[PDB]
Symmetry: C2
Subunit: 414 residues, 2 copies
C-alpha cells in the first residue's frame, strides 16, 4: 500500500500533492494545509482520510532536511520496519535515495544514479543542448556560453534569425532566471523575467549584464538561444522504470497577454503527432538508457510552418503531473480520449469552505455523476499567487465557460 509523498523542490503550495494519496500514505509539506483539505480530497477520491497522514516540516525539504535524524525519525514512526512502504519524491536526489536506505523502504529506482546526483546532471540546460545535439533531436540554434565574451559573440550571431534571443540560467525550474533580448522596440517573451533591447554599439554591457545575472559559484554556464514565436507550445511527461518509458500526457502551458506570467495548464495538448512524439520518444529512451528512473518532462514548440523544436527537460515532477493524476483517478486512464482539463492558478485566495461555496454558487463544483466541474488543489498557493483550481469537461467550449463563471464568482487576482 503506502508511500511517502515528498515534494522536495498560511501558504499551502504543497497541499496539491495530497491528490496523489492512497490509503495509508503520508504527505510531507514544508508549509501549511487547510485542516479540512485532506478530508475533502479523500471524499472526492473515495479513500479513507483517517488513514492518510500529513507530516509538517517548518522548512523547505532540502537535502539537509532529508538527512536530518529527527526528520527521519518522524517518517520512520510511520514506516516501521519499512515493509510495504515506498518513497514518492519529486526529485530523485542523493538524500532521497539515502532516505530509502535509512527507512528500509523499497529502494529508490535508479538508486546508484541518484547516489551520484545523476539528476543534477540531467537538469542542466547545457546538458540538454549537448545530449540533444549529439542525438539529433530538433534544437534551436544556440551556445553553451562559458563566459561573457562567449555571450557577446553568441548574441551577435543568434539575434539575426528572428530578431529575438533568450539567455537562460543553467540550473533551476521556471521562467524566472531567463532574460529576453529583442531587436524590436516591443517584447513578447513567455517565460522570461525581463526583455532587454539589443544594441550593436553596447555589446559588452549587455553580455556583462546577462553573465552576472544568470551565474553564481555553482553555475558558470549560460545557455544562449535563438527564440521563436510559437503557434503551439507543449510539453510531454513520462514515467521511466527498468521496463519502459511510458508517455503519460501532453499538456500546454498558458501565459497571460516582455514577461508573460504563467497562468495555467490546458492539457490534452494539440501537438501529439509523429514529428513531436517520435523524436521526443527517442530522446527520453536515451535518458532512460543512461539510467534515470522517475518522472521526466520534455517541452517544445511547433512553428506555424510545422517546424518542431525541443527546449528543455526536467527530471522531476512536472507541475502538471498532479493534474494528470487526478484526471486519471476521477475519469479513468482513458480520460484524454473524451475529456479536457484546465487549471486556474489565479483565483482569489479564500478558505476551503468559501472556495467550494463559490464553485457551487457558480454551478461548477465537481460532480461525480457527470465527471464535470472543478476541484481545489490549493486555497492559498504561490503557484500563480492564489487559489489553484482544476476544471474538467467533456467539451472544450463548456470548459471555457466554467472558467469564466469561476472567475466571475470566485474572483481572480487580475
Amino acid at each position: 500500500m503506502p508511500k511517502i509523498i515528498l515534494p522536495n523542490f498560511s501558504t499551502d503550495t504543497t497541499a496539491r500533492f495530497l491528490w496523489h494519496a492512497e490509503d495509508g500514505d503520508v504527505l510531507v509539506i514544508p508549509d501549511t494545509v487547510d485542516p479540512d483539505f485532506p478530508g475533502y480530497v479523500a471524499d472526492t477520491l473515495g479513500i479513507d482520510g483517517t488513514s492518510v497522514h500529513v507530516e509538517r516540516t517548518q522548512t523547505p525539504l532540502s537535502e539537509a532536511v532529508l538527512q536530518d535524524p529527527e526528520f527521519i525519525d518522524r517518517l520512520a514512526a510511520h514506516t516501521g520496519t519499512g515493509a510495504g512502504w515506498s518513497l514518492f519524491p519529486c526529485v530523485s536526489t542523493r538524500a532521497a535515495a539515502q532516505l530509502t536506505r535509512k527507512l528500509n523502504v523499497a529502494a529508490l529506482d535508479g538508486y546508484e544514479f541518484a547516489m551520484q546526483n545523476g539528476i543534477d546532471l540531467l537538469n542542466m540546460k547545457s546538458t540538454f543542448r549537448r545530449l540533444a545535439a549529439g542525438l539529433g533531436t530538433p534544437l534551436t540554434d544556440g551556445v553553451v556560453a562559458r563566459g561573457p565574451a562567449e555571450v557577446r559573440s553568441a548574441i551577435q550571431e543568434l539575434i539575426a534569425e528572428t530578431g529575438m534571443v533568450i539567455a537562460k540560467q543553467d540550473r533551476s525550474g521556471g521562467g524566472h532566471g531567463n532574460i529576453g533580448i529583442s531587436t524590436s522596440p516591443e517584447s513578447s517573451f513567455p517565460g522570461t523575467r525581463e526583455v532587454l533591447a539589443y544594441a550593436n554599439d553596447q555589446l559588452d554591457t549587455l553580455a556583462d549584464t546577462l553573465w552576472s545575472q544568470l551565474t553564481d559559484t555553482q553555475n558558470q554556464f549560460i545557455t544562449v538561444e535563438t527564440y521563436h514565436r510559437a503557434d503551439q507550445r507543449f510539453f510531454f511527461e513520462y514515467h521511466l522504470d527498468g521496463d519502459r518509458a511510458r508517455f503519460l500526457h501532453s499538456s500546454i502551458l498558458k501565459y497571460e497577454q516582455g514577461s508573460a506570467k504563467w497562468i495555467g495548464l490546458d492539457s490534452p495538448s494539440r501537438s501529439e503527432f509523429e514529428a513531436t512524439l517520435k523524436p521526443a520518444e527517442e530522446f527520453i529512451e536515451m535518458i532512460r538508457t543512461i539510467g534515470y528512473r522517475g518522472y521526466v518532462n520534455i517541452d517544445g514548440i511547433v512553428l506555424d510552418d510545422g517546424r518542431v523544436f525541443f527546449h528543455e527537460i526536467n527530471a522531476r515532477w512536472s507541475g502538471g503531473l498532479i493534474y494528470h493524476t487526478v484526471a486519471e483517478r476521477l475519469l479513468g486512464h482513458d480520460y484524454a480520449r473524451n475529456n479536457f482539463f484546465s487549471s486556474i492558478l489565479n483565483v482569489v485566495p479564500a478558505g476551503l469552505a468559501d472556495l467550494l461555496r463559490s464553485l457551487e454558487r457558480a454551478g461548477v463544483r465537481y460532480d461525480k455523476d457527470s465527471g464535470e466541474g472543478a476541484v481545489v488543489l490549493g486555497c492559498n498557493s504561490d503557484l500563480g499567487p492564489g487559489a489553484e483550481l482544476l476544471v474538467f469537461s467533456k467539451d472544450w467550449d463548456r470548459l471555457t465557460a466554467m472558467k469564466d463563471e469561476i472567475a466571475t464568482t470566485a474572483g481572480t487576482l487580475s
Copy 2:
C-alpha cells in the same frame, strides 16, 4: 590529405610524436619545436613521400583562440584550397575544431553539432563518468561526487574503511597530478598521484578544507572522492566511434615504478569477457549520446577477479600513436604475435645522436625483423625526456632491448 591537430616551445618536441600519423600530403600543426630531420626520418621509416608532408608551426599552444584566428585559418587554407579531399584530424573535437572544418570547407567534423555545444567538455569530467557509469550499471568503485569541504570530509570518513586508501580527484584533471591519495598506512603506493596525505581523524577538518581548495577552481566546483583499491592488472581500452560502430583499437598498460608514469606496454593482460563486455556497453552508450572520434576507458582488475572502471577520456590517448605505429610497421593484428613498450625518460639528445645510440645498442628498428626502436620525440615534456617506442615478438626479448637502450642512451632516475 589531413591536418593533424594536437589541441612557449622551451625547445621541446612533445607534439612531434604525432608525425607518425602522417600520410602523403598531410599537414601537421605544432606548437613548440621539432628537429628539422624528424619529418624525413619518419617518412624514411614509414615509407611515405616525405616531401609531401608539410609542417605548420605556431609559437603558442593550439587553444580555442588560435583555432579561431583568421590568420591561423589562412595559413591552413594555403594547403586546402576549395576543401576537396581534405579532413581535420583533431586530438579534441572542440567547438572551434568543428568551426574550423566549416571555415576551411573541409569534410565536416563527425559529431559536428555535439562538438559545437562542447559536448566533449561534458564527457571529459570525472563526475560525468561516475554518473553515467552508475545508472548504466558499469562496475565503479565506491565514491562520491563531492560538492563542498564538508562533503569531502564525510566522503573520506565513510570511504576509508574498505581499504584504508582513498583517492581525491580533480574533476577535469590530466592523469595524476590533480589526484591526491589519502592513506591510513604510510606504505601504500597510489601509482600516478600528486601527493599522498595521511589520514588522521583529529586533522580531517583541515584535510577536507585544503583538499577542496587544491582541487577546485572557478569552473570546477566538483571533487571526486573514491575508495582506492590495490590492483593486480591495470589497463585501458581505446576505441574509434563513428555513425556506424565503436571499433576496439587496442588495450594497453600504464607503467610506473608517488609512483611516476614511466611508459606503457601493449597487449594488456586484461582482455577477457569480464572486461571487454562492460567497457563495450558503456562506450556504446557514449556513441549513442553522440560522441564521434577516439575515446578510451581506464580500469583495474583486483586479485579476487573484480573489475572496476575509473574514467573515460574522449580524446586521443597517449598511446594511440603507439598503436598507429604498430599497425603501419607490423601489420593489422600485430598484438597477437608482437609486443610494444614505450620509454618516456631517455636522456634527451639530438635525433642523430639518439639513432646512433640505438644502432650502438644493436636495436635500431629493423624492418626485416619487425624488431627494434623508433624515436617519437628527442626532447619532450612527457617523461619528461626523449620518448622511444620499442617492438619485439618476444616479451622477454623486448625487456632485454629496453635495458640495452637504458645502458647505451641513458635514462633519468
